Amino acid sequence: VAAERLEPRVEEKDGYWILKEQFRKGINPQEKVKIEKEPMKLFMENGIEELAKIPIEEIDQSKLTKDDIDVRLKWLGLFHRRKNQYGRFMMRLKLPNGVTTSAQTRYLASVIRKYGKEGCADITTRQNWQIRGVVLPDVPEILKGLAEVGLTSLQSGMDNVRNPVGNPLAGIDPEEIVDTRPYTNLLSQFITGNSRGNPAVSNLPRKWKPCVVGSHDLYEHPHINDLAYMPATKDGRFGFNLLVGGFFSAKRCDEAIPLDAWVPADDVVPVCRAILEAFRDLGFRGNRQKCRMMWLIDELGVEGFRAEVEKRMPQQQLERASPEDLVQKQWERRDYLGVHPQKQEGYSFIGLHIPVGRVQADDMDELARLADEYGSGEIRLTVEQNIIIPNIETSKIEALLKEPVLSTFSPDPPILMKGLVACTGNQFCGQAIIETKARSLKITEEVQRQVSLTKPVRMHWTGCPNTCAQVQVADIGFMGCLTRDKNGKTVEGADVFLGGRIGSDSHLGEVYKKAVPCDDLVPLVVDLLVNNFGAVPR
Ligand code: SRM
Ligand code: SF4
Ligand SMILES: O=S([O-])[O-]
Ligand SMILES: [Cl-]
Ligand SMILES: [Cl-]
Ligand SMILES: [K+]
């Protein structure tokens, strides 16, 4: 790698970061959008106020404003559903470590309730909230309302640092390694500039995903993150070994690799900043399929990339990885659904199943009520799109289990439902090839009617090759496609994946059978479960 390759390609100009004039050749259309107008201005210079007043039919008549609503608004966490819900916006938060409050939950419910049949909410595979139905004129008031209840939606889409994932059992599990909340909180505060916006990390070549590990279970999926902090002691000091570059895409899925770096716990934010600066400064900005950070690591080599991180650390110091980390390889991933004792004597948490992560306003209010009556007003989201209500006096559990809403959001659903994960799909997503959430529920119900089993088989349904529902981590994965029935008629189908493993002995699954009509999946899956997962016909 020539020394010229290491010249930073962006510069700070009037508070924002922009591609230098000599590096603008050959860039992709999204890079052109960012140059034409700085997306962060919509928030930081309150550009959204005037934009929100323009009727959407008028907005669509000019490239600048159409790009504002279809692209730049994703820096404020707003996602125009142009194809499938025209004129409505999905809104995505920052929710470090998946932690929410009852007050926040009620606020989100009040927003979606306004939109009737156009509104609902979802828990995401990054233990985050999305709300639906938002109209542009309401955006300024919603931004204000979110701020009032201690939420931000900043920098949650496009070329930004995505939700910081942590241990859903942080602070409450007798078996945790380290409470991840302080670290994910710090990362979120850094990324968003304490909810004011942070332009230094908002002009990346591509999205970038961080997680902090605190569980032996590896609930955080460090193997598939751009930056994973693995807790490790080095020379008698607590800190983290760093894994880099994990990502999924239509083209390529790669597990994170060691940076060969350890940082003391207090250096979590400094090293996040150094890695982001290196990626920002040096990353390819051509073909979008070659812009994730792993591509930079392959171009420079991991050592070349490491040197770039090191030069951006305070005092330019970056220690080598500790030979061992604190994560025990002898471990069985634990079910968190149901009632479990906390490390605080006399308290329990309860994991509740949320079918395919989908809730309505009334459901959110009920969950918020439970958290107030039984817990401490806290609701935690998980990456399997479920919830945990912590801090429940154990004496209250008997009464809790009789609550009617627990028949719908159950502490002990059938085993296949416990592990079922599904993305948005074509109900709302314009990229989706098939419908996912309703279909996956229907198929899983029919499968479980036919077989019993004891192994916690994890089934993931994703609507297109972007693999937001991570089919490559599943015991059985389903990737949306169009295929043909026996008569040659177009029908929805799935490419079926096998081989995904999570925890310390992680592995990426691969396509097992292509183009199976969705209507034909039940017998295929029943047989797979019996033949490979010890299932028994009923
Ligand atoms: C909501 C969510 C799936 C869910 O049902 O849970 C989702 C939904 C979408 N993702 Fe994703 N992604 C979700 C996690 C993922 C993950 C899983 C993860 O983070 O562990 C991945 C695979 C891992 C990765 O990215 O490395 C993922 C890979 C993508 C990709 C392909 C990335 C690539 O490098 O090619 C895209 C397309 C893109 O960004 O260019 C994408 C694009 C999209 C968009 C924003 C596309 C769009 O504008 O319509 C989807 C919005 C649909 C909607 O209305 O909800 N989504 N997406 C997840 C929100 C996470 C969050 O709260 O921040
Ligand atoms: S995997 Fe495809 S269909 Fe599903 S939410 Fe992601 S982009 Fe949409
Ligand atoms: O929007 S997806 O990348 O989480
Ligand atoms: Cl996006
Ligand atoms: Cl769309
Ligand atoms: K779920």
Residue 450 belongs to what H/E stretch? helix 437-450
Alpha carbons 151 and 352: distance in angstroms, whole number? 23
How much distance in Å is there from the Cα of 430 to the middle of ligand 6? 22
Please list, in sequence order, all residues whose beta carbon lies within 8 angstroms of the beta carbon of residue 185, skipping any fewer than 6 positions away: 96, 97
Q: How is 473-527 classified by DSSP, letter by letter?
A: GSSEEEEEEEEE-TT--EEEEEEEEE--B-SSS-B--EEEEEEEEGGGHHHHHHH
> In whole angstroms, what separates CA 81 from the centre of its chain?
19
Alpha helical stretches, state H, 40-180: 41-44, 47-51, 56-59, 63-70, 102-113, 139-148
| CA neighbor of 472 nearest in space, from 447, 496, 454 | 496
Q: What angle (nearest 5°) sits at the alpha carbon of residue 85, between those of residues 379 and 420?
A: 45
Question: Could you tell which of 160, 162, 431 is best to mutate to test the pocket of ligand 3, judged by most ligand atoms within 8 Å of the CB?
Answer: 162
The answer to whether 208 touches 163, Cβ cutoff 8 Å, is: no
How much distance in Å is there from the Cα of 106 to the middle of ligand 5? 28
β-bridge mates for residue 350, sequence order: 339, 389
Q: How many CB atoms lie under 10 A from the CB of residue 534?
A: 13
Q: Amino acid letter at 319?
A: E
Alpha carbons 412 and 93: distance in angstroms, whole number? 29
Please state the atom number of ligand 1 nearest to the C-alpha of residue 92: 62
Alpha carbons 177 and 213: distance in angstroms, whole number? 8
Please list, in sequence order, all residues whose beta carbon lies within 8 angstroms of the beta carbon of residue 524, skipping any fewer than 6 positions away: 496, 513, 516
Alpha carbons 471 and 466: distance in angstroms, whole number? 10
| CA neighbor of 240 nearest in space, from 213, 209, 274 | 213
Range list of β-strands (E), 370-449: 378-381, 387-393, 421-422
Between the alpha carbon of residue 42 and those of residues 45, 149, 160, the distances in Å are: 6, 21, 15
Between the alpha carbon of residue 24 and those of residues 63, 278, 284, the distances in Å are: 20, 18, 11
Sign of CA dihedral 12, 13, 17, 21: negative
DSSP state of 137: G
Give 268: exposed, middle or buried? Use CB within 10 Å, 0-12, 13-18, 19+: buried
Q: Whose CA is nearest to atom 2 of ligand 2?
A: 464
Q: At residue 482, what are phi and psi to the nearest 5 degrees?
A: -100, 140
Please list, in sequence order, all residues whose beta carbon lies within 8 angstroms of the beta carbon of residue 105, skipping any fewer than 6 positions away: 364, 365, 367, 368, 371, 379
Q: Amino acid letter at 480?
A: G
Give 12: exposed, middle or buried? Use CB within 10 Å, 0-12, 13-18, 19+: exposed
Question: Does residue 230 sit in helix, strand or coil?
Answer: strand
Elucidation method: X-ray
Residues with CB under 6 Å of ligand 3 are: 157, 162, 207, 468
* Ligand 2 in reach of 440 Cβ (< 6 A): no
How many Cα atoms sit within 13 Å of 449 on the Cβ side?
8
What's the start-to-end Cα distance of the chain, in Å?
A: 62
DSSP state of 388: E
For 90-127, b/e burial (b = at least 16 CB within 10 A) is bbbbbbbbbbbbbbbbbbbbebbbebeebbbbbbbbbb
Task: Pull the structure tokens for residue 214.
Answer: 């605190």
Give the β-pairing of 227-234 and 210-212. Answer: parallel
DSSP state of 321: P
Q: Which residue has the tokens 């306004």?
A: 114
Alpha carbons 466 and 430: distance in angstroms, whole number? 12
* Ligand 2 in reach of 423 Cβ (< 6 A): yes
Instruction: Write 47-50 long-range contacts (CB < 8 A, 24+).
Output: 48/73, 48/76, 48/139, 48/140, 48/143, 49/140
Give 397: exposed, middle or buried? Use CB within 10 Å, 0-12, 13-18, 19+: middle
Q: What domains can you pick out in the chain, each with its CATH number?
A: 1-149+336-413 (3.90.480.20), 150-335 (3.30.413.10), 414-538 (3.30.413.10)
Give the β-pairing of 510-517 and 490-498. Answer: antiparallel
> In whole angstroms, what separates CA 84 from the centre of its chain?
22
The answer to whether 399 touches 348, Cβ cutoff 8 Å, is: no
Chain breaks in the chain (C to N over 2.5 A) after: none
Q: At what resolution in Å was this solved?
A: 1.5
Q: Which residue has the tokens 């192994």?
A: 455
Q: How many CB atoms lie under 10 A from the CB of residue 352?
A: 22
Question: Does residue 212 sit in helix, strand or coil?
Answer: strand
Alpha carbons 188 and 96: distance in angstroms, whole number? 6
Please list, in sequence order, all residues whose beta carbon lies within 8 angstroms of the beta carbon of residue 83, skipping any fewer than 6 positions away: 430
How much distance in Å is there from the Cα of 446 to the middle of ligand 5? 31
Alpha carbons 55 and 200: distance in angstroms, whole number? 32
Question: Does residue 196 sit in helix, strand or coil?
Answer: coil
Alpha helical stretches, state H, 79-134: 102-113
Q: Whose CA is nearest to atom 4 of ligand 3?
A: 468
Alpha helical stretches, state H, 122-264: 139-148, 181-192
| CA neighbor of 183 nearest in space, from 119, 91, 267 | 267
Q: How many CB atoms lie under 10 A from the CB of residue 454?
A: 10
> In whole angstroms, what separates CA 207 from the centre of its chain?
11
The answer to whether 44 touches 38, Cβ cutoff 8 Å, is: no
DSSP state of 159: S
